């Protein structure tokens, strides 16, 4: 308003094109019907707003703000990243003169909702991840072997409804709630270097997940426990005959021409063990 | 180059009074319609192969690209509205003019009065030109742009 | 600017060799020397202002810091 009073002094006024942008937006007269007009952005900051009364009261809104920032990452149109391609339109077309103007009024105050939006939603992701993974990965495999030295196994069938790359439930974990932030980049899992402003991983846990990619590619290949290691026997100082067992299959080596004996694990025998003779 | 002699001040000044020398040196006032029309079919036909003639800057290595789009598309510090700022002015001469049928789609260009409210207007290019423009300024800087700028090229 | 109207003395004039690649910047009338100008380059440092403007912004791990010279 008192902006609008002084860029009409002198009598259209004298410095009619310095103030010109400016006062072009607060106009609403708008004979074209599809300007910039100042009008359309704060009633566009009141509806990113009305978004954030639904979230932080009424009710859980971890969840639902999780569910707001995982949308931004991967698509579009929620809308907190179209009001910022609309704000900076407006500050864009001004003149680049009243830059540091339209940068402060027209892209800042909606752009600051983002850097708040994201910490919250970081946290959601995981008290989605300690009651979606972690708590069913303890709750089978604590306290077996090989995780813990006891007597006890942990049981292969359901050890690869895990670790798979395509369908096992932590890589399906990951393209449902981190679709935007992390790359299945050949083997290995790596953070996009896209989209990952003020958004950090804690550096064991990519170390976990590009060790559980990694047993995935050695052992269970084909989508099963299975894989294809070979022996070959060797001599020792007054030793007549070393027998290996393998869930039956056999070496015994008397100390003849040395071969490979092409074993497998774990083979559907009867009583699958190992023991050395 | 347009060759002068074709300007509005050259049309209100020393056309008019220089027509009226010859027409006392056939009936003069209907000679007055066939020589002024016969001029202004050569005064569109001179600047048509001016504007026609202009080609554009050979820019490269996208910073000259984001650079001429914020040129081009900028009020008060650009061609283009400073272009059709002076070609508005000679679509105007003689009066809806009498050349007025070929000067008549550009200057119906930077009207913005679209009374059917979607015309091309040359607003709503300029305001389209720079949503590109702000698009590869995120692209350029902030962040790690050839991750960004596969993920444009690829989906087109 | 004080630089620029002192190379118009006299009368383009006759300190022409002296002052010839400094004025050759400010003048857009230089419609072939590959455009070189002193104008594109305040704006072509205004962005690795702005770029530094995001490091002294949130810049809170000590990384995105680099994260802008991981680029270079």
Same mark, same amino acid.
């Given at each position: 308003?008192?902006?609008?009073?002084?860029?009409?002094?002198?009598?259209?006024?004298?410095?009619?094109?310095?103030?010109?942008?400016?006062?072009?937006?607060?106009?609403?007269?708008?004979?074209?019907?599809?300007?910039?007009?100042?009008?359309?952005?704060?009633?566009?900051?009141?509806?990113?707003?009305?978004?954030?009364?639904?979230?932080?009261?009424?009710?859980?809104?971890?969840?639902?703000?999780?569910?707001?920032?995982?949308?931004?990452?991967?698509?579009?149109?929620?809308?907190?990243?179209?009001?910022?391609?609309?704000?900076?339109?407006?500050?864009?077309?001004?003149?680049?003169?009243?830059?540091?103007?339209?940068?402060?009024?027209?892209?800042?105050?909606?752009?600051?909702?983002?850097?708040?939006?994201?910490?919250?939603?970081?946290?959601?992701?995981?008290?989605?991840?300690?009651?979606?993974?972690?708590?069913?990965?303890?709750?089978?495999?604590?306290?077996?072997?090989?995780?813990?030295?006891?007597?006890?196994?942990?049981?292969?069938?359901?050890?690869?409804?895990?670790?798979?790359?395509?369908?096992?439930?932590?890589?399906?974990?990951?393209?449902?709630?981190?679709?935007?932030?992390?790359?299945?980049?050949?083997?290995?899992?790596?953070?996009?270097?896209?989209?990952?402003?003020?958004?950090?991983?804690?550096?064991?846990?990519?170390?976990?997940?590009?060790?559980?990619?990694?047993?995935?590619?050695?052992?269970?290949?084909?989508?099963?426990?299975?894989?294809?290691?070979?022996?070959?026997?060797?001599?020792?100082?007054?030793?007549?005959?070393?027998?290996?067992?393998?869930?039956?299959?056999?070496?015994?080596?008397?100390?003849?021409?040395?071969?490979?004996?092409?074993?497998?694990?774990?083979?559907?025998?009867?009583?699958?063990?190992?023991?050395?003779? | 180059?347009?060759?002068? %002699?074709?300007?509005?001040?050259?049309? =209100?000044?020393?056309?008019?009074?220089?027509?009226?020398?010859?027409?006392? =040196?056939?009936?003069?006032?209907?000679? /007055?319609? /066939?020589?002024?029309? /016969?001029?202004?079919?050569?005064?569109?036909?001179?600047?048509?192969?001016?504007?026609?003639?202009?080609?554009?800057?050979?820019?490269?290595?996208?910073?000259?690209?984001? =650079?001429?789009?914020?040129?081009?598309?900028?009020?008060?510090?650009?061609?283009?509205?400073?272009?059709?700022?002076?070609?508005?002015?000679?679509?105007?001469?003689?009066?809806?003019?009498?050349?007025?049928?070929?000067?008549?789609?550009?200057?119906?260009? %930077?009207?913005?009065?679209?009374?059917?409210?979607?015309?091309?207007?040359?607003?709503?290019?300029?305001?389209?030109?720079?949503?590109? /423009?702000?698009?590869?300024?995120?692209?350029?800087?902030?962040?790690?742009?050839?991750? %960004? %700028?596969?993920?444009?090229?690829?989906?087109?």
């Amino acid at each position: 308003n008192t902006l609008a009073v002084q860029g009409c002094t002198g009598q259209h006024g004298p410095l009619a094109t310095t103030f010109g942008p400016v006062l072009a937006l607060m106009d609403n007269q708008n004979n074209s019907a599809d300007m910039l007009n100042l009008q359309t952005y704060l009633t566009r900051v009141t509806q990113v707003r009305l978004r954030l009364q639904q979230i932080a009261g009424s009710s859980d809104p971890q969840a639902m703000m999780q569910l707001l920032a995982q949308t931004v990452l991967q698509g579009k149109s929620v809308d907190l990243t179209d009001t910022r391609d609309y704000g900076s339109l407006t500050a864009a077309g001004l003149g680049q003169e009243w830059y540091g103007f339209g940068q402060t009024v027209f892209v800042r105050p909606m752009e600051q909702a983002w850097q708040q939006v994201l910490t919250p939603a970081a946290e959601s992701l995981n008290a989605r991840w300690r009651t979606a993974v972690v708590d069913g990965w303890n709750n089978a495999f604590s306290g077996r072997y090989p995780f813990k030295n006891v007597s006890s196994d942990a049981s292969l069938p359901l050890l690869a409804k895990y670790l798979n790359t395509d369908t096992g439930r932590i890589a399906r974990f990951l393209q449902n709630n981190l679709s935007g932030v992390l790359h299945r980049e050949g083997s290995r899992w790596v953070p996009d270097t896209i989209n990952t402003r003020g958004l950090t991983f804690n550096p064991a846990f990519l170390k976990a997940i590009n060790t559980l990619s990694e047993i995935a590619d050695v052992a269970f290949t084909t989508g099963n426990a299975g894989l294809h290691f070979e022996l070959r026997p060797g001599t020792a100082a007054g030793v007549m005959q070393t027998t290996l067992i393998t869930d039956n299959q056999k070496l015994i080596y008397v100390n003849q021409m040395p071969v490979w004996k092409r074993f497998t694990w774990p083979a559907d025998t009867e009583a699958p063990g190992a023991s050395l003779s | 180059v347009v060759p002068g %002699m074709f300007t509005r001040q050259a049309w =209100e000044e020393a056309v008019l009074p220089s027509i009226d020398t010859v027409i006392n =040196e056939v009936s003069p006032e209907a000679l /007055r319609q /066939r020589l002024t029309t /016969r001029y202004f079919a050569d005064f569109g036909n001179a600047w048509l192969n001016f504007l026609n003639s202009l080609h554009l800057r050979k820019a490269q290595t996208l910073s000259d690209v984001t =650079e001429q789009l914020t040129l081009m598309a900028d009020v008060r510090q650009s061609p283009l509205v400073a272009l059709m700022n002076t070609l508005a002015v000679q679509g105007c001469t003689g009066q809806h003019g009498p050349l007025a049928t070929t000067f008549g789609p550009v200057l119906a260009l %930077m009207d913005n009065q679209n009374n059917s409210a979607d015309m091309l207007n040359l607003q709503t290019y300029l305001t389209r030109v720079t949503q590109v /423009r702000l698009r590869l300024q995120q692209i350029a800087g902030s962040s790690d742009p050839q991750a %960004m %700028m596969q993920l444009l090229a690829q989906t087109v």
